[PDB]
Design an enzyme around this catalytic site. Structure first.
Site, short mmCIF file in Angstrom:
data_model
loop_
_atom_site.label_atom_id
_atom_site.label_comp_id
_atom_site.label_asym_id
_atom_site.label_seq_id
_atom_site.Cartn_x
_atom_site.Cartn_y
_atom_site.Cartn_z
CD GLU A 35 -3.26 -0.62 0.21
OE1 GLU A 35 -3.10 0.27 -0.36
OE2 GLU A 35 -3.89 -1.76 -0.08
CG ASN A 46 -8.96 6.71 -4.24
OD1 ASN A 46 -7.90 6.14 -4.51
ND2 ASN A 46 -9.32 6.99 -2.80
CG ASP A 48 -14.17 8.73 -4.90
OD1 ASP A 48 -12.86 9.18 -4.92
OD2 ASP A 48 -14.76 7.83 -4.22
CB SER A 50 -11.80 9.76 -1.84
OG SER A 50 -11.72 8.51 -2.57
CG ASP A 52 -6.57 5.63 -0.55
OD1 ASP A 52 -7.80 5.81 -0.34
OD2 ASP A 52 -6.42 4.73 -1.64
CG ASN A 59 -10.92 6.15 0.12
OD1 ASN A 59 -11.15 7.39 0.22
ND2 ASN A 59 -11.44 5.31 -0.51
CG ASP A 101 -15.92 -2.77 7.22
OD1 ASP A 101 -15.69 -4.12 6.93
OD2 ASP A 101 -15.78 -1.97 6.53
#
Ligand SMILES: [Cl-]
Ligand SMILES: [Cl-]
Ligand SMILES: [Cl-]
Ligand SMILES: [Cl-]
Ligand SMILES: [Cl-]
Ligand code: NA
Length: 129
Positions: A35, A46, A48, A50, A52, A59, A101
């Site tokens: 990562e 990203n 969209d 957003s 990281d 994110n 989650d």
């Protein structure tokens, strides 16, 4: 801060990630390698809009606030800049919420494509833990 492999393994173990939700320490070191290349200051945008952040590339669409991701959530209740610190505490505590989650470590695309199903124990081989 750019961690060494065994240095990061030991820091993650001290913070309770070894076998957390059943994921052995090597999984977490492997995810961090691919990562961020072990660099706490890594950022990536990203499509969209957003971004990281940090050693585990968390994110802003869901997990932290960076003031520039409209309509997003802040489920770890932190500014995203806190995930870039040399102290990995904030990143680890947020990662614990993510992995809990329902989807496990599949949230990390690099883990799913480069660590899942491999001999992840090799990532902590030789380390004093
Ligand atoms: Cl390495
Ligand atoms: Cl392991
Ligand atoms: Cl925002
Ligand atoms: Cl620490
Ligand atoms: Cl799981
Ligand atoms: Na956000």
């Amino acid at each position: 801060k750019v961690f060494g492999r065994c240095e990061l393994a030991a820091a993650m173990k001290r913070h309770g990630l070894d076998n957390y939700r059943g994921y052995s320490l090597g999984n977490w070191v492997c995810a961090a390698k691919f990562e961020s290349n072990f660099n706490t200051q890594a950022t990536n945008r990203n499509t969209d809009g957003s971004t990281d952040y940090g050693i585990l590339q968390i994110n802003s669409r869901w997990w932290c606030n960076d003031g520039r991701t409209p309509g997003s959530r802040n489920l770890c209740n932190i500014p995203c800049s806190a995930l870039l610190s040399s102290d990995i505490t904030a990143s680890v505590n947020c990662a614990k919420k993510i992995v809990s989650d329902g989807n496990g470590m599949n949230a990390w695309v690099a883990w799913r494509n480069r660590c899942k199903g491999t001999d992840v124990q090799a990532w902590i081989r030789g380390c004093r833990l």
